[PDB]
UniProtKB/Swiss-Prot annotation:
Similarity annotation: Belongs to the spectrin family.
Residue positions where Phosphoserine is found in the record: S14, S31
Protein name: Spectrin alpha chain, non-erythrocytic 1
Pathological condition linked to this protein in its record: Developmental and epileptic encephalopathy 5: A disorder characterized by seizures associated with hypsarrhythmia, profound intellectual disability with lack of visual attention and speech development, as well as spastic quadriplegia. Developmental delay with or without epilepsy: An autosomal dominant neurodevelopmental disorder apparent from infancy or early childhood, and characterized by impaired intellectual development, speech delay, motor delay, and behavioral abnormalities. About half of patients develop various types of seizures. Some affected individuals have cerebellar atrophy and ataxia.
Source lineage: Eukaryota, Metazoa, Chordata, Craniata, Vertebrata
Protein task: Fodrin, which seems to be involved in secretion, interacts with calmodulin in a calcium-dependent manner and is thus candidate for the calcium-dependent movement of the cytoskeleton at the membrane.
Naturally occurring in which organism (per UniProt): Homo sapiens (Human)
SUBUNIT field: Like erythrocyte spectrin, the spectrin-like proteins are capable of forming dimers which can further associate to tetramers. Interacts (via C-terminal spectrin repeats) with TRPC4. Interacts with CALM and EMD. Interacts with isoform 1 of ACP1. Identified in a complex with ACTN4, CASK, IQGAP1, MAGI2, NPHS1 and SPTBN1. Interacts with SHANK3 (via ANK repeats). Interacts with CLN3; this interaction regulates the fodrin localization at the plasma membrane.
Domain annotation SH3: ranges: 1-54
Subcellular location per the Swiss-Prot or TrEMBL entry: Cytoplasm, Cytoskeleton; Cytoplasm, Cell cortex
Length: 57
């Protein structure tokens, strides 16, 4: 699966979200929504704002 780059820190604020740090390389799981993408960070999966990551490939 594709990788995305965290452009900002984001702290999860709902049970379906996940936290990321700027510079993190996240695995993209689902980009079907315009605003929230499902990613894998560490060993957690959840949603982060699509604007706060950049797809690499
Ligand atoms: N998290």
């Amino acid at each position: 699966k594709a990788l995305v780059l965290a452009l900002y820190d984001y702290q999860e604020k709902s049970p379906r979200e996940v936290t990321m740090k700027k510079g993190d390389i996240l695995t993209l799981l689902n980009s079907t929504n315009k605003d929230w993408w499902k990613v894998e960070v560490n060993g957690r999966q959840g949603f982060v704002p699509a604007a706060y990551v950049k797809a690499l490939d």
